[PDB]
Homo-oligomer: A and B are copies of this chain.
Amino acid sequence: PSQVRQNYHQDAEAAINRQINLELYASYVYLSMSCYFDRDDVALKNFAKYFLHQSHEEREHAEKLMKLQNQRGGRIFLQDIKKPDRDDWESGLNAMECALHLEKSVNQSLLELHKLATDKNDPHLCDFIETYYLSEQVKSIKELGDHVTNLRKMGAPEAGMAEYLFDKHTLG
């Protein structure tokens, strides 16, 4: 047992390892989306910039959980990062809808983690999740819902100027 370990259940250590994998997976999905919008047959630079920013943010989320695991005296066990479900993301609207789905799935994972920390009476870990993860997920899910709403009303993907003008106005 680590000299620093105190009130850190083996189940919490295991759940934090699963979450690190999921944040690294989310980072890979966003990178896949970023490089789709950089294709010459798609060519939406501000969609590509937006998803690359999200990819980097998710890597910072993963790295902060790795820091937490080490501060609490747990041990990081890394696993394969699975390839994303698509190479071709079809449209700006479809990628925003898939990003929304991914962010809600990551949020559900964190709520299951908070529930585990509550059941194991781990107040430091509960507060860590609330402070740096849950606040930020609610704000992300709302941003993506807003983007989806706006793109559907402008008539994306069938309206050719919808994603062009969204790329300049909302994402530019």
Query: Which residues of the partner chain B approach A83 to less than 8 Å between Cβ atoms?
Result: 78-80
Are B138 and A124 in contact, with the CB atoms below 8 A? Answer: yes
Are B149 and A153 in contact, with the CB atoms below 8 A? Answer: no
Query: Which residues of the partner chain B approach A127 to less than 8 Å between Cβ atoms?
Result: 130-131, 134-135
Closest to A39 in B: B70
Nearest CB of B to A131, in Å: 7
CA distance A69 to B67 in the complex (A): 33
Query: Which residues of the partner chain B approach A66 to less than 8 Å between Cβ atoms?
Result: 31, 35, 38
- Chain A contact residues: over half helix, strand or loop, or mixed? helix
Query: Which residues of the partner chain B approach A138 to less than 8 Å between Cβ atoms?
Result: 71-72, 124
Q: How many copies of this chain? A: 4
Nearest CB of B to A37, in Å: 10
Are A87 and B80 in contact, with the CB atoms below 8 A? Answer: no
Interface residues of A in 61-84 (CB under 8 A from B): 63, 66-67, 69-73, 75-84
Q: How large is the interface on A (under 10, 10 to 19, 20 to 34, 35 or more residues)?
A: 35 or more
Are A111 and B4 in contact, with the CB atoms below 8 A? Answer: no
Are A3 and B100 in contact, with the CB atoms below 8 A? Answer: yes
List 14 additional A-B contacts (Cβ < 8 Å) besides A40-B145, A72-B138, A80-B81: A2-B41, A3-B100, A35-B70, A38-B67, A39-B75, A40-B73, A40-B142, A40-B146, A43-B146, A71-B142, A124-B138, A154-B164, A159-B161, A165-B169
Are A40 and B2 in contact, with the CB atoms below 8 A? Answer: yes
Interface residues in chain A, defined as those with a beta carbon under 8 Å from any beta carbon in chain B: 2-4, 6-7, 28, 31-32, 35, 38-43, 45, 52, 59, 63, 66-67, 69-73, 75-84, 87, 100, 104, 107-108, 111, 114-115, 118, 121, 123-124, 126-131, 134-135, 138-139, 141-142, 145-150, 152-155, 159-165, 168-169
